[PDB]
Design an enzyme around this catalytic site. Structure first.
Site, PDB file in Angstrom:
ATOM      1  N   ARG A  54       0.808  -1.164   0.081  1.00 40.87           N
ATOM      2  CA  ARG A  54      -0.077  -0.154  -0.180  1.00 40.87           C
ATOM      3  C   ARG A  54       0.876   1.235   0.043  1.00 40.87           C
ATOM      4  O   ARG A  54       1.662   1.340   0.667  1.00 40.87           O
ATOM      5  CB  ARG A  54      -0.994   0.033   1.368  1.00 40.87           C
ATOM      6  CG  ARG A  54      -1.933   1.228   1.328  1.00 40.87           C
ATOM      7  CD  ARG A  54      -2.350   1.280   2.745  1.00 40.87           C
ATOM      8  NE  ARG A  54      -3.329   2.518   2.931  1.00 40.87           N
ATOM      9  CZ  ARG A  54      -3.858   2.748   4.061  1.00 40.87           C
ATOM     10  NH1 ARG A  54      -3.505   2.448   5.103  1.00 40.87           N
ATOM     11  NH2 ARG A  54      -4.762   3.896   3.949  1.00 40.87           N
ATOM     12  N   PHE A  59       2.064  10.215   1.734  1.00 42.20           N
ATOM     13  CA  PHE A  59       1.551   9.914   3.399  1.00 42.20           C
ATOM     14  C   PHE A  59       2.247   8.838   3.857  1.00 42.20           C
ATOM     15  O   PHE A  59       2.973   9.091   4.706  1.00 42.20           O
ATOM     16  CB  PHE A  59       0.117   9.773   3.073  1.00 42.20           C
ATOM     17  CG  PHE A  59      -0.658   9.543   3.953  1.00 42.20           C
ATOM     18  CD1 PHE A  59      -0.484  10.185   5.353  1.00 42.20           C
ATOM     19  CD2 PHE A  59      -1.584   8.422   4.227  1.00 42.20           C
ATOM     20  CE1 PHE A  59      -1.244   9.879   6.433  1.00 42.20           C
ATOM     21  CE2 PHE A  59      -2.429   8.168   5.250  1.00 42.20           C
ATOM     22  CZ  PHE A  59      -2.321   9.200   6.495  1.00 42.20           C
ATOM     23  N   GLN A  62       3.104   1.144   3.191  1.00 40.97           N
ATOM     24  CA  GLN A  62       2.748   0.164   4.493  1.00 40.97           C
ATOM     25  C   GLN A  62       3.095  -1.235   3.799  1.00 40.97           C
ATOM     26  O   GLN A  62       2.776  -1.494   2.660  1.00 40.97           O
ATOM     27  CB  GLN A  62       1.190   0.338   4.804  1.00 40.97           C
ATOM     28  CG  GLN A  62       0.667  -0.613   5.769  1.00 40.97           C
ATOM     29  CD  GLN A  62      -0.637  -0.315   6.164  1.00 40.97           C
ATOM     30  OE1 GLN A  62      -1.222   0.925   6.045  1.00 40.97           O
ATOM     31  NE2 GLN A  62      -1.515  -1.468   6.486  1.00 40.97           N
ATOM     32  N   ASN A 101      -3.090  -0.197  11.964  1.00 41.70           N
ATOM     33  CA  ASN A 101      -4.154  -0.988  12.675  1.00 41.70           C
ATOM     34  C   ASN A 101      -5.447  -0.347  11.982  1.00 41.70           C
ATOM     35  O   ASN A 101      -5.609   0.200  11.195  1.00 41.70           O
ATOM     36  CB  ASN A 101      -4.233  -0.318  14.069  1.00 41.70           C
ATOM     37  CG  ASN A 101      -4.622   1.205  14.415  1.00 41.70           C
ATOM     38  OD1 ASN A 101      -5.330   1.636  13.989  1.00 41.70           O
ATOM     39  ND2 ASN A 101      -3.594   1.902  15.017  1.00 41.70           N
ATOM     40  N   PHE A 112       4.146   0.862   8.858  1.00 41.47           N
ATOM     41  CA  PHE A 112       4.172   1.676   7.663  1.00 41.47           C
ATOM     42  C   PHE A 112       5.254   2.832   8.020  1.00 41.47           C
ATOM     43  O   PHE A 112       5.682   2.992   9.115  1.00 41.47           O
ATOM     44  CB  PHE A 112       2.962   2.504   7.286  1.00 41.47           C
ATOM     45  CG  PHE A 112       2.312   3.266   8.466  1.00 41.47           C
ATOM     46  CD1 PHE A 112       2.668   4.582   8.457  1.00 41.47           C
ATOM     47  CD2 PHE A 112       1.417   2.710   9.311  1.00 41.47           C
ATOM     48  CE1 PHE A 112       1.962   5.506   9.387  1.00 41.47           C
ATOM     49  CE2 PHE A 112       0.749   3.443  10.400  1.00 41.47           C
ATOM     50  CZ  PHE A 112       1.143   4.905  10.352  1.00 41.47           C
ATOM     51  N   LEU A 121      -2.640  11.197  12.576  1.00 37.91           N
ATOM     52  CA  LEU A 121      -2.449   9.851  13.361  1.00 37.91           C
ATOM     53  C   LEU A 121      -1.883   9.985  14.647  1.00 37.91           C
ATOM     54  O   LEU A 121      -2.008   8.873  15.416  1.00 37.91           O
ATOM     55  CB  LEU A 121      -1.479   9.076  12.316  1.00 37.91           C
ATOM     56  CG  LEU A 121      -2.094   8.831  11.066  1.00 37.91           C
ATOM     57  CD1 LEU A 121      -1.104   7.838  10.347  1.00 37.91           C
ATOM     58  CD2 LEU A 121      -3.418   8.341  10.659  1.00 37.91           C
ATOM     59  N   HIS A 125      -1.819   5.791  16.295  1.00 38.11           N
ATOM     60  CA  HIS A 125      -1.051   4.701  15.720  1.00 38.11           C
ATOM     61  C   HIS A 125       0.544   4.727  16.397  1.00 38.11           C
ATOM     62  O   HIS A 125       0.828   5.904  16.827  1.00 38.11           O
ATOM     63  CB  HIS A 125      -0.470   4.913  14.262  1.00 38.11           C
ATOM     64  CG  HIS A 125      -1.744   4.523  13.371  1.00 38.11           C
ATOM     65  ND1 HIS A 125      -2.660   5.576  13.087  1.00 38.11           N
ATOM     66  CD2 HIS A 125      -1.865   3.304  12.701  1.00 38.11           C
ATOM     67  CE1 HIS A 125      -3.663   4.890  12.157  1.00 38.11           C
ATOM     68  NE2 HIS A 125      -3.227   3.532  12.065  1.00 38.11           N
TER      69      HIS A 125
END
Length: 170
Positions: A54, A59, A62, A101, A112, A121, A125
């Site tokens: 991903r 950004f 991951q 998560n 990531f 975040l 996270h």
């Protein structure tokens, strides 16, 4: 003393990826559960031959799913484990390493790297490591890929192998 000064790290992992080497310094004091999980999986070869499935430009990139699907992966604990936040570990720059998560207290194996800021975040996270200055370029290269509409690279980069250079739990 710079603003946003982070606590000292303790623990080091080297990912040998298809984008080059990525050297991660760990916040094992602040995020011991996440760091122990990452080290043990690393040692058990669990991240070897896994893809970075991903990429969201600017950004995150991951990975850490042994299935490569985006939905797999489990922790060493037998169930997803708790979040660990610290007010001095914040998503205020690129080059941080954090757990993926799908809710609170839902850490598995996926993690990531931050490609930019990700303030939204903070407190959501676990941030457990940072990439060395001299391997940030390779980390960013994981994202230098043509991407499909589900954020999946057409040709994902991969971790060939993970090794623990310094184990702070020894």
């Amino acid at each position: 003393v710079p603003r946003g000064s982070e606590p000292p790290t303790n623990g080091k992992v080297l990912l040998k990826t298809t984008a080059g080497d990525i050297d991660i310094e760990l916040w094992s004091k602040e995020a011991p559960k996440a760091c122990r999980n990452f080290i043990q999986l690393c040692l058990e070869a669990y991240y070897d031959n896994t893809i970075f499935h991903r990429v969201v430009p600017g950004f995150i990139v991951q990975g850490g799913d042994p299935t490569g699907t985006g939905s797999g992966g489990e922790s060493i604990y037998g169930a997803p484990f708790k979040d660990e936040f610290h007010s001095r570990l914040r998503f205020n720059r690129r080059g941080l390493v954090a757990m993926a998560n799908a809710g609170s207290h839902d850490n598995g194996s996926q993690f990531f790297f931050t490609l930019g800021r990700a303030d939204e975040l903070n407190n959501k996270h676990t941030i457990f490591g940072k990439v060395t200055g001299d391997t940030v370029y390779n980390m960013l290269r994981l994202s230098e890929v043509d991407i499909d509409d589900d954020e999946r690279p057409h040709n994902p980069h991969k971790i060939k192998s993970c090794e623990v250079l310094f184990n702070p739990f020894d």
